[PDB]
Design a binder for this molecule. Structure first.
Ligand SMILES: CCOC(=O)c1ccccc1S(=O)(=O)NC(=O)Nc1nc(Cl)cc(OC)n1
Ligand SMILES: CCOC(=O)c1ccccc1S(=O)(=O)NC(=O)Nc1nc(Cl)cc(OC)n1
Lengths: 349, 349
């Protein structure tokens, strides 16, 4: 059912700073080609979209895309089925979707000169990085190798091109400045729930430690674990005995403790191996990363928290990729999110 | 005024091509840091958003942002009032809003290496260009100089930060590929009307010559004129006696003649001087640019066309900037668009 009734919708920019070129702006001189002379540039701002239902219930949801993605992934699946934006406006929540600084409609900080360079200052690096289709195929666990699907896959087959077209690079904006923009959004919104994904998992945890308005977190397949400073547990290398997962983020314990004050759920899909898998690097990477997250959640619970790990196969859902919210069974995944919101009173006024 | 009822909404990717790095992808080797080895990259694809009302009447509208912009400018004004997307869904049209290749949720083609470079191939230039706040202020005719406003201005004063935060750079993707993506969209949708702005003006004219499904064009402040090959009239240089306007685009007469088969309206706001203005480059640029457009429309009409120029002040609207659809009087600007659609039956089934 695709119908949606909105009390209001719109979008806006929030956060960011400015940087300035040298010299002066003279309106009598040719303005094009564009010049850094007398220039003021707005950089690192974030794009925010909102859709509000009639008679909302409970807290607004802020959907935060994963690495190299945009708010598109909450709008529609690659095969054109409704995304979580539609599903949760229908579930009577106001829904915010963002494009974080450096992605989509967020700002890409570049000027007149080599990419990212403002005269002699490097605002972001000129050299970029970006996953290939092949790297994303195995990262997202469509299958063990590019072009191959797990038998049980919930991926919308036949729409591979549509899916990979949604992905791209991120300039080297500091994570601090990305967190700063979302903290400012949370200040503007009021009490809310963060729904994060992959690379935004660790960022949403950080935002919660700076923003008491975050009243709950649901993180789909978070990519980087978080621990109190100096208390990172033993985490093994990968099966190739040379690689490691992402270095866990460490925060002051007084900030980490704020994570124990709200309900937190990490959600993982299927086909993460239980045993070392040296033939398939990213499958093994997910094995050890999920393990590190289990230890992170345990650390929160030992501070009095309520942090849980939901493996979708234990709930009866088999074959999900790293994007469970755009898989073929995304309505069932959404139902589990509604269950979490209902258990914790986040769907009541 | 804010309530919107959607039979369906969503977004999707369309257009683009693929490029590749050397070698083969091995899933047992570390996938991160990302590599060009064995890589397939999707590049130059376009993001498309659609909102459809219950029981649409007439043709879908395709809103195409100007230079360095995104579909945000059709969603909301800088001060948060409804944009043309909401207004025309309420006016019973299905509305498509795009982020063209190179902008917003469209693809920015870059890889592992210096910006835009895939091994030894330069997909897009590493050196970028980007307007300052000051350049944009005078380009968009907020006032003759940064910080100043024209009398009776319709700009949402006080929301300059929001406004300028929506602007950014565009990589050097060829115009051919941008036009290609929209031609593909037009085929997918079927008969439609293109509503363009500034830089997308000339591109929309080109799309229409390649796509019969374009049944009408409304262009807000187009930046580049279009003429038949070898038939560009004499265009005076600017008052500084050194600058000129954008070199007019020239196409084969066969293609140019297609523009005479559909209704076309160019819409201009206020404060474009009638006489030479050497002290204000962009004001003078706009004077001669509008003059060139008048001759372009004359050429279309001499081939049997239905082309017209609408100056908002003559319609009773004073103070508009180069973004009349986000100005304080944008509802009145929308009414004039509805009038054009009604005159040509483009609001009827
Ligand atoms: C599903 C969309 O993709 C992701 O978010 C994702 C998922 C798993 C692993 C890495 C990423 S990532 O590419 O975004 N990377 C990161 O999460 N951050 C990151 N951290 C480190 Cl230490 C290195 C690195 O290199 C690209 N990248
Ligand atoms: C409202 C956003 O601003 C515009 O769309 C706009 C308006 C007037 C002039 C130029 C642009 S532009 O910067 O987008 N540029 C172009 O339209 N194209 C363009 N053509 C040429 Cl031959 C040169 C050039 O240099 C920046 N740029």
């Amino acid at each position: 059912k695709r119908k949606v009734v909105l009390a209001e919708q719109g979008s806006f920019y929030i956060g960011g700073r400015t940087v300035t070129g040298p010299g002066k702006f003279d309106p009598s001189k040719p303005v094009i080609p564009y010049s850094n002379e007398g220039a003021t540039f707005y950089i690192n701002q974030m794009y925010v979209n909102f859709q509000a239902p009639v008679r909302p219930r409970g807290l607004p949801l802020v959907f935060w895309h994963g690495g190299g993605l945009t708010g598109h992934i909450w709008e529609s699946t690659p095969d054109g089925r409704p995304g979580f934006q539609t599903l949760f406006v229908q579930d009577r929540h106001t829904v915010y979707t963002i494009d974080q600084p450096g992605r989509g409609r967020g700002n890409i900080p570049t000027f007149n000169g080599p990419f990212g360079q403002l005269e002699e200052e490097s605002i972001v690096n000129t050299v970029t990085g970006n996953s290939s289709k092949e790297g994303a195929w195995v990262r997202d666990r469509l299958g063990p190798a590019p072009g191959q699907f797990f038998e049980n896959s919930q991926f919308p087959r036949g729409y591979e091109d549509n899916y990979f077209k949604e992905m791209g690079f991120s300039p080297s904006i500091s994570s601090d400045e990305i967190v700063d923009a979302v903290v400012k959004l949370v200040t503007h919104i009021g009490p809310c729930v963060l729904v994060t994904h992959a690379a935004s998992g660790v960022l949403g945890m950080r935002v919660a430690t700076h923003a008491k308005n975050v009243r709950g977190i649901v993180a789909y397949e978070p990519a980087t674990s978080i621990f109190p400073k100096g208390k990172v547990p033993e985490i093994p290398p990968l099966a190739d005995k040379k690689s490691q997962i992402f270095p866990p983020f460490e925060i002051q314990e007084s900030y980490f403790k704020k994570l124990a004050k709200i309900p937190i759920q990490f959600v993982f899909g299927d086909n993460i191996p239980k045993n070392p898998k040296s033939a398939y690097w990213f499958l093994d990477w997910w094995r050890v990363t999920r393990y590190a997250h289990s230890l992170s959640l345990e650390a929160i619970n030992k501070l009095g928290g309520q942090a849980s790990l939901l493996d979708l196969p234990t709930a009866g859902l088999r074959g999900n990729t790293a994007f469970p919210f755009t898989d073929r069974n995304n309505v069932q995944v959404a139902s589990l999110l509604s269950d979490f919101l209902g258990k914790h009173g986040l769907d009541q006024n």
